[PDB]
From a paper:
1 This clock is composed of a transcriptional regulatory network of clock genes, Period ( Per1 and Per2), Cryptochrome ( Cry1 and Cry2), Clock and Bmal1. In the core feedback loop of the mammalian circadian clock, transcription factors CLOCK and BMAL1 activate transcription of Per and Cry genes by forming a heterodimer. The translated PER and CRY proteins then repress the transcriptional activity of CLOCK-BMAL1 to close the loop, followed by the degradation of PER and CRY through the ubiquitin-proteasome pathway reactivating CLOCK-BMAL1. 31 CRY is a repressor of CLOCK-BMAL1, and CRY stabilization reduces the expression of CLOCK-BMAL1-target genes such as Per2.
Residue numbers in the entry: 2 to 41, 47 to 230, 233 to 405, 412 to 494
Amino acid sequence: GVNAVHWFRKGLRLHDNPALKECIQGADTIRCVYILDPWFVGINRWRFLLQCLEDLDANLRKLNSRLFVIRGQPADVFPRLFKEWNITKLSIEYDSEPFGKERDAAIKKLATEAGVEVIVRISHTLYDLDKIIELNGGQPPLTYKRFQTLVSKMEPLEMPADTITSDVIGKCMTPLSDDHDEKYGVPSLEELGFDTDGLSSAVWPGGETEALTRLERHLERKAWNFERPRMNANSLLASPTGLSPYLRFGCLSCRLFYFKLTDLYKKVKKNSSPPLSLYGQLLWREFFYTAATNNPRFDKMEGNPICVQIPWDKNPEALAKWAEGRTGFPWIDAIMTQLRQEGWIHHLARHAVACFLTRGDLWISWEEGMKVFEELLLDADWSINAGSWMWLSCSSFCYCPVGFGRRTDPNGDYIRRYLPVLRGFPAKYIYDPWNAPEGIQKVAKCLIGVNYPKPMVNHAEASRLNIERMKQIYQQLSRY
Ligand SMILES: COc1ccc(/C=N/NC(=O)CSc2nc3ccccc3n2C)c(OC)c1OC
């Protein structure tokens, strides 16, 4: 009969999954596979992924199916699967990222050689990015405002695809052996080799089920403005309404999010012509995917045509201090600790630690900060992470590491939550503990230089030098 495989990579969901819906159409058997290579990334990313697969597996059970988790690399695994399962249809959600496109072109050639039809559908982005690039003339818009103009002229988005249900599955069945778990089951972090003794309950549980619950809560919060919210101290904490990791893994469809937001706006504001500001989260995301898709050096400075060639410092010791939250600036270190422990920090917290590392204090390449966020951050994939780091560092498209935190959370509770060694300090000194008298340091049981490091730069001197560097660079921008 007709034996189909849907290959999950992103799009880790059953709702709005047109590739999977089309693949099941006219198929006698369906197997959903995730190809896992744990030896080819921080532990919170692995955990989030595994939880996404457990959720997918549980939701597939409802359809008399299971997720097949296969170890290895797609180029080695799919030829054997095509033969051992007699596959003639393989579906994927389209991946616009350069190395994804290259991988998928290689797989499509194997599938062509084996007599397998490849179904590719766009549903990780709102638009066909290639059509945006055609509308701008063959080059991506390199400013957000130009991106918004292009997008506002595009044909309206079609409805998200129907969720896979039993009436959709129909006659299509999944052949299952009794030892499915032993051979195809979702592994634990331990079975990938990680110690989990230090881990607590995940602040960001993976999965489509979690995503659809959060989407509902997110919309209620927006219904009880549609303008960009203002950050306060509470905004720094992970929110039960946060959607960004779910959008990054495809647990939540960006198109379903778009339609629900539009429906809420129309119900609350009573106009069918909402401002594109309603969609800023999704359109910035779409902007960077568009910028990145045809630029295989998007995550690099040298050889990247859109990146200013800035002579960054090379300083592995300062880089590691920043990455490990040992800068001696409690605001910076608390943010980097939350990122390390939980996998998410507020975007203005991102601005602060990125400015500190790059154009503000340490003059280290944005490429280095990007790699750290890649390991630790749940919601930033290759295109978004690179684009955001170039944007922040003034490389394409000055935060005070004391006063920003002090203005955001003057009582210092954010610091005390993530930097316990500093809990004894009073508010007057919690953001600048080097300024506390030796008496206050001793009472706080935290000698600066012993129990918590001294600040790694003088901010005023470092920012003054770096602000002059960036002014001179842009005063001669064509040189760079
Ligand atoms: C240093 O790294 C980062 C720096 C900044 C941001 C985002 N800051 N967001 C704003 O300033 C308000 S608008 C907005 N919504 C977006 C959604 C996606 C991508 C960009 C976005 N922008 C600009 C970030 O998150 C992606 C980073 O992580 C990699």
